[PDB]
């Protein structure tokens, strides 16, 4: 049998529904989102970290001249200097006086500690939602993971639950995402090849162990001044370090909907947003004939004292008369009241306590003890506690949220105005007919 | 120190140092009684939803105003066209039978 619900996507809150087939005893349905994963499709561009400025030993063909060449090393900078006469510990390093040429080389590497302290630049496409469900039908519990797309039939044994499309398309990640030691940032990194000196991504490589590193770190080779051999150079600050100082707070702390940002793989777990249209094809054997379940002769609902809060702030006793003992499913036929119980034991004459939760200031709902709908009426006072540590089990509607005293006053005012204008219209027509008969 | 943070029906998560996050949700504990006198009801629903309750109260004020000024306008129109068309006609006499039934 096919049942189409709409489960609120809040992890942990059970969603209760009653499936009634003609000729078959009502079955209790219980859908819980144990966990959720928002996994985007990732694409790694490059890996960046602090650069190691490698200055080789200066070359002095120092009676003659040297030529600058081209190398594939990262940010390979070269410069030829006119007349040097370099010194070391030992005096003059060659013979001709001002015919001495020094070649300064400076490229960029990956720091030795980069295998631990590095960032990964990623582009993430549309995200996919996957949920863990705890469908409880009858007295059988089934755990199962389904894709939230509307077509994939994730099934544990014989449940065949199809998770409909999520009502709201939400993704806490931007197009470009930076991952550094497990912390996820939304950064607009430069593309592969567009290295900006002094900014994030000034040194790029496909991997840490790659030999095709590309860099642009603004290395300016300066003319030596001192007599001792020297490679004077100046450089821009590490873009990785500058970004680390100005990174802001991660997505783990700036995420919406209480999302838990996790890595390996990148995902946003336990996000509370939207509604999921679940469709369950319950196996036939779970249902039982209407003859097998006990039949309620008459029942009546009295509600002890209720508040409308997140937790189960309500109590309810109903006196029933059953002709046979057995188990009967209990359900609240209302969107603003949810029962804590699902099945209960009925024994001839008895009374049972059912705890519920409400968002309206009225227990104005219906309860079914394996059929035999009965109505409750009471006053739900506001809770004394201001802050609780548990999510609200029921959403806040309008006709429910407005109480009956306020409804009575509103209808008194509006109906007074409407009756006033109706009396005005009737005296209008009566006076008009009197005038028409006058002349 | 002390820090004041606003909590709503959706919740709030705060992390203090190297502590596990703790989440808190706000209940509808507005001052007043939703089932008391109208002023207590208005206090409750103004603390809960101010703009909505202002809209509803302005709606009832407009409904009473436009509707008392409409029934009264129609009443005055009927009075005028019951007193003028032949009763107030110069040198004309209207006895009690067709005067006092609506007039005065």
Swiss-Prot record, chain B:
A lipid is attached at residues 82, 102-103 (S-palmitoyl cysteine). It comes from Western equine encephalitis virus (WEEV). Residues 84-104 are annotated as: Transient transmembrane before p62-6K protein processing. The chain crosses the membrane at residues 55-75. This is Spike glycoprotein E2. It is found in: Virion membrane; Host cell membrane. Palmitoylated via thioester bonds. These palmitoylations may induce disruption of the C-terminus transmembrane. This would result in the reorientation of E2 C-terminus from lumenal to cytoplasmic side. N-glycosylated. Plays an essential role in viral attachment to target host cell, by binding to the cell receptor PCDH10. Some specific strains may also bind host receptors VLDLR and LRP8/APOER2. Synthesized as a pE2 precursor which is processed by furin at the cell membrane just before virion budding, giving rise to E2-E1 heterodimer. The pE2-E1 heterodimer is stable, whereas E2-E1 is unstable and dissociate at low pH. pE2 is processed at the last step, presumably to avoid E1 fusion activation before its final export to cell surface. Residues 77-81 are annotated as: Interaction with the capsid protein. Disulfide bonds join 82-103. Glycans are attached at residue 4. It is a single-pass type I membrane protein. The chain holds residues 634 to 737 of 1236 of the full protein. Interacts with spike glycoprotein E1. Processing of the precursor of protein E3/E2 into E2 and E3 results in a heterodimer of the spike glycoproteins E2 and E1. Spike at virion surface are constituted of a trimer of E2-E1 heterodimers. Interacts with 6K protein. The E2-E1 heterodimer interacts with host PCDH10 (via domain Cadherin 1); this interaction mediates viral entry to the host cell. Residues 76-104 are cytoplasmic.
């Amino acid at each position: 049998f096919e049942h189409a619900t709409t489960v609120p996507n809040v992890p942990g809150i059970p969603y209760k529904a009653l499936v009634e087939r003609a000729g078959y005893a009502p079955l209790n349905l219980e859908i819980t989102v144990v966990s959720s994963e928002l996994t985007p499709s990732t694409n790694k561009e490059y890996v960046t970290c602090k650069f190691h400025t490698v200055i080789p030993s200066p070359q002095v063909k120092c009676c003659g001249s040297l030529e600058c060449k081209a190398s594939s090393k990262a940010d390979y900078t070269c410069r030829v200097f006119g007349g040097v006469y370099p010194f070391m510990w030992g005096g003059a390093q060659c013979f001709c006086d001002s015919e001495n040429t020094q070649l300064s080389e400076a490229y960029v590497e990956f720091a030795p500690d980069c295998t631990i302290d590095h960032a990964v630049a990623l582009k993430v496409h549309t995200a996919a939602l996957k949920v863990g469900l705890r469908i409880v039908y009858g007295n059988t519990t089934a755990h199962l993971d389904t894709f939230v797309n509307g077509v994939t039939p994730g099934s544990s044994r014989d449940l065949k639950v199809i998770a409909g499309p999520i009502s709201a398309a939400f993704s806490p990640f931007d197009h470009k995402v930076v991952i550094r030691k497990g912390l996820v940032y939304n950064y607009d990194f430069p593309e592969y090849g567009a290295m900006k000196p002094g900014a994030f991504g000034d040194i790029q490589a496909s991997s840490l162990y790659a030999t095709d590193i590309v860099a642009r770190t603004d290395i300016r080779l300066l003319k030596p001044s001192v007599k001792n051999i020297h490679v004077p150079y100046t450089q821009a600050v590490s873009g990785y370090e500058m970004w680390k100082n100005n990174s802001g707070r991660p997505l783990q702390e700036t995420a919406p909907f209480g999302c838990k940002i996790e890595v390996e793989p990148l995902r946003a777990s336990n996000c509370a947003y939207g509604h999921i249209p679940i469709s369950i094809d319950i196996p036939d054997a779970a249902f039982v004939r209407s003859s097998e379940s006990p039949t309620i002769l008459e029942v009546s609902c009295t509600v002890a004292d209720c508040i409308y809060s997140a937790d189960f702030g309500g109590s309810l006793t109903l006196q029933y008369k059953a002709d046979r003992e057995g188990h009967c499913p209990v359900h609240s036929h209302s969107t603003t009241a949810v029962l804590k119980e699902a099945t209960t034991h009925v024994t001839a004459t008895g009374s049972i306590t059912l705890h519920f939760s409400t968002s309206s200031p009225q227990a104005n709902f219906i309860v079914s003890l394996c059929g035999k709908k009965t109505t409750c009426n009471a006053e739900c006072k506001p809770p004394a506690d201001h802050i609780i540590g548990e999510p609200h089990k029921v959403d806040q509607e309008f006709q429910a949220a407005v109480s009956k005293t306020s409804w009575n006053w509103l209808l008194a005012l509006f109906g007074g105005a409407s009756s006033l204008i109706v009396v005005g219209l009737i005296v209008l027509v009566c006076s008009s007919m009197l005038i028409n008969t006058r002349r | 120190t002390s820090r004041n943070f606003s909590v709503g029906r959706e919740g709030l998560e705060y992390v203090w140092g190297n502590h596990e996050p703790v989440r808190v949700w706000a209940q509808e504990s507005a001052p007043g009684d939703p089932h008391g006198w109208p002023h207590e009801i208005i206090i409750h629903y103004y603390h809960r939803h101010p703009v909505y309750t202002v809209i509803v109260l302005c709606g009832v004020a407009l409904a009473i105003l436009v509707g008392t000024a409409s029934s009264a306008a129609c009443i005055a129109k009927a009075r005028r066209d019951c007193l003028t068309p032949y009763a107030l006609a110069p040198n004309a006499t209207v006895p009690t039978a067709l005067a006092v039934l609506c007039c005065i």
